[PDB]
């Protein structure tokens, strides 16, 4: 999270940390008692690494009563996701057991209505990813407010050159951006999950290359089919 600051601990109880071999790998949002939504490209290079989800966390290292590390029973990448593209970059992880809900662990309802967020709208995104151009990572959760950028502008040849489909959305990236390690995390607009951070192969903070986010509403039927 470039250009932001440390969040209030446990003020976003849906925030999750997808872990690979006991280290933070990607963000994630709890969308059901036993399911966490994340980005499919997080697990492309994971190989046989141990995939776990850390819930109720603010600091990745310090002890906190609400922190609980869950094993993953089942990983469901979107069947049409591949390393070559950013399309369908969604991942659903089933926890070993239903999460212990509380004031620090609560599922976030995701947007089921397929409307674009009006441009300029400020949306909230959080993660444990890069926080400065030096590429270093923070221990406690960071967050920032980002204005939404319309798809046609985002598709200009200077920006993402027609790569932003109807199932994707952009936010400005001038000094404020989501970075590597924020992938799979939530882009909340109006207190509802609107987009999932993809990023991955993009350097952040360059206004020339806006941040990309997978619109959850475009994949409502699939999410329902997996969670059913």
């Amino acid at each position: 999270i470039l250009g932001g600051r440390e969040a209030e601990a446990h003020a976003r109880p849906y925030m999750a940390s997808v872990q690979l071999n006991g280290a933070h790998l990607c963000g994630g949002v709890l969308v059901a008692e036993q399911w966490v939504l994340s980005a499919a490209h997080c697990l492309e290079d994971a190989a046989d690494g141990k995939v776990q989800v850390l819930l109720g966390a603010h600091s990745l290292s310090q002890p906190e009563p609400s922190k609980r590390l869950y094993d993953v029973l089942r990983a469901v990448p979107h069947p049409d996701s591949q390393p070559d593209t950013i399309d369908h970059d969604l991942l659903l992880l089933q926890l070993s057991e239903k999460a212990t809900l509380g004031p620090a662990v609560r599922p976030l309802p995701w947007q089921r209505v397929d409307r674009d967020v009006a441009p300029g709208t400020l949306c909230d995104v959080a993660g444990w990813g890069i926080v400065n151009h030096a590429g270093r990572r923070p221990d406690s959760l960071q967050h920032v407010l980002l204005p939404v950028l319309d798809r046609a502008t985002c598709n200009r040849r200077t920006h993402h050159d027609g790569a932003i489909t109807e199932r994707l959305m952009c936010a400005e990236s001038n000094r404020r951006d989501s970075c590597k390690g924020d992938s799979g995390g939530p882009l909340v607009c109006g207190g509802v999950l609107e987009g999932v951070v993809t990023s991955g192969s993009r350097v952040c903070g360059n206004r020339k290359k806006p941040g990309i986010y997978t619109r959850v509403a475009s994949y409502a039927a699939w999410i329902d089919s997996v969670l059913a």
Epitope: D150, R151, A152, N155, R156, R157, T158, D161, G162
Partner: antibody, heavy 115, light 108 residues
């Protein structure tokens, strides 16, 4: 198959206005800017302006800002360029092109301005 | 306004020759440069964007180089259908500007 087809040739008097259309098909019209290029006979290319089809917002070359108008009918996936206060130096072929993705271009529209 | 100074104005070569076309920007435009091909009476056709990225269906013999101010269109093995006019375009800054063009003729 994606294609941008433009309206037919037009002949106008050194004072009238002209409105050229550019109907897109084969892709989501609202996902890409549309920019307009002009080419005088036996001459180079010249950038007129672009339009955001969802918001109607435009960015113009200052040379054309005062007397050009770009509009859009999202229901018919059509983009329009209106040039008023015509002069003989406006006699040229007018192209529409899509900003971003594969570089689709219209076939062109010839606009002749003479007395 | 950023000037795109294309060189040379015309150029004569044979089939199979390697040919170079040049475009110099009056200030940095990063890699926001595109190359177009145009044959008489037809609409311009896209070849390269982002200085070096070919479009789909463009033969591999076309290649683009450059970042900053100096950009180069290269045709490795000139084919008969390649003899035409080529334009460079800058889209880094409003207004977008073209080069005056380069005509590629057959040597005889």
């Amino acid at each position: 198959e994606v294609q941008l087809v433009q309206s037919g040739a037009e002949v106008k008097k050194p004072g009238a206005s002209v409105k050229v259309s550019c109907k897109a098909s084969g892709y989501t019209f609202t996902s890409y800017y549309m920019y307009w290029v002009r080419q005088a006979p036996g001459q180079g290319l010249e950038w007129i302006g672009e339009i955001n089809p969802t918001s109607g917002g435009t960015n113009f070359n200052e040379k054309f800002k005062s007397r050009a108008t770009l509009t859009v009918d999202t229901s018919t996936s059509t983009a329009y360029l209106e040039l008023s206060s015509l002069r003989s130096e406006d006699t040229a072929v007018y192209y529409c092109a899509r900003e971003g993705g594969f570089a689709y271009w219209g076939q062109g529209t010839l606009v002749t301005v003479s007395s | 306004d950023i000037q795109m100074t294309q060189s040379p104005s015309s150029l004569s070569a044979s089939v199979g020759d390697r040919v170079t076309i040049t475009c110099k920007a009056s200030q940095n435009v990063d890699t926001d440069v595109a190359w177009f091909q145009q044959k008489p009476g037809k609409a311009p056709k896209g070849l390269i964007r982002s200085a070096s990225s070919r479009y789909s269906g463009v033969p591999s013999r076309f290649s683009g180089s450059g970042s900053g101010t100096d950009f180069t269109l290269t045709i490795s093995s000139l084919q008969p259908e390649d003899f035409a006019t080529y334009y460079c375009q800058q889209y880094n800054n409003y207004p977008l500007t073209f080069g005056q063009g380069t005509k590629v003729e057959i040597k005889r």
